[PDB]
Amino acid sequence: KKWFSEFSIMWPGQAFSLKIKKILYETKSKYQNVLVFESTTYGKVLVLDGVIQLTEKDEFAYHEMMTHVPMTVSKEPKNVLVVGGGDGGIIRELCKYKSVENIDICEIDETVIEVSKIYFKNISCGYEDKRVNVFIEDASKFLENVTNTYDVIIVDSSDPIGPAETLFNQNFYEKIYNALKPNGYCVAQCESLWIHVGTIKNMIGYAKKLFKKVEYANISIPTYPCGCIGILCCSKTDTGLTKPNKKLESKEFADLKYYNYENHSAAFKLPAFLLKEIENI
């Protein structure tokens, strides 16, 4: 059996590898190289431009924290935007909320959606929900043109090198701010505290120019570089996103594997070195 190895200039001098049971699908889409394989111990794996996007074994950690942090704080979220997220993980978690009336998703690469529907049925199941509306477009452009405002925006993007380049700048955060309701919230994929402090500082700086409360949370997930990835958390009120307003007690949430009421707040308790780096932004 051969091994898949994840290299990037975004994490120089380190690599994570997974043993390949079998390769399932490969293509070059309009935007990126796509690889799907069954790993020996992590289930099926989606790879975009050589970077692990998700695995079956651990995706719930990232999808549950990204979704349930803002969705338990927002009082009565009706309209939600997912930026990126073609795999459907975020949408799957959002559909658990009966109060949600509309879920828009803006994914740049339609190939990702169709690959997820074929190879990852338990992740992409949310596309069958009638509330879900799909837009195939660079979210940077979508957000410039949208007429609606949202209660929650979830930026489920890949890394700043690649198609997600347009999502890691000041202008993007202006577009997010404007596309949110006066009491709206945004959470965004915001990299690893172990290797990406420069990016984290930059992103916090962008968010603070517009949002009155900007916070950072950490998620444990073994198949992202350094075994963790952060959530940049953006609020227009000053109460912020650290404290949930509701408990997820209905039958739809009985299946949760990572998120709970207590670890919501725990995720925001950061290592000393990180607090020091971000204090004067």
Ligand X SMILES: NC/C=C(\CCCCCN)SC[C@H]1O[C@@H](n2cnc3c(N)ncnc32)[C@H](O)[C@@H]1O
Size of the site for ligand X (CB under 6 A): 29
Query: Which residues inside 2-61 make contact with its own copies, applying CB under 8 A?
Result: 3, 5, 12-19, 39-42, 58, 61
Does residue 256 belong to the site contacting its own copies (CB under 8 A)?
yes
Site string for its own copies, 61-90 (x = CB under 8 A): x-----------------------------
The residue annotated as part of the active site, out of 58, 87, 138, 156, is: 156
Using alpha carbons, list the distances in angstroms from residue 66 to 10, 144, 156, 267: 22, 23, 8, 11
For residue 38, list its beta bridge partners. Answer: 22, 44
The phi, psi pair for 27, rounded to 5°, reads -155, 160
Q: How many residues in total does the chain contain?
A: 281
Does residue 108 belong to the site contacting ligand X (CB under 6 A)?
yes
Q: Which stretch binds its own copies (CB under 8 A): 27-35, 72-80, 179-187, 221-229?
A: 221-229
Residues 6+ apart with CB under 8 A from 144: 175
Q: What is the DSSP string of 147-203?
A: -S-EEEEEEE---TTTGGGGGSSHHHHHHHHHHEEEEEEEEEE---TTT-HHHHHHH
Does residue 45 belong to the site contacting ligand X (CB under 6 A)?
no
**62 or 172: whose CB is closer to its own copies?**
62
Does residue 183 belong to the site contacting its own copies (CB under 8 A)?
no
**190 or 241: whose CB is closer to ligand X?**
190
**84 or 244: whose CB is closer to ligand X?**
84
- For the question of residue 156 being annotated catalytic, the response is yes
* DSSP state, residue 224: S
**56 or 240: whose CB is closer to ligand X?**
56
- Tell me, what amino acid is at 76? E
CA angle 29, 116, 254 (to 5 degrees): 155
Does residue 163 belong to the site contacting ligand X (CB under 6 A)?
yes
Catalytic positions, please?
Answer: 156
Residues placed in the known binding site: 156
- Binding footprint of its own copies on the chain (CB under 8 A): 3, 5, 12-19, 39-42, 58, 61, 192-195, 218, 220-222, 225-228, 256-260, 262-263, 265-266, 269-273, 275
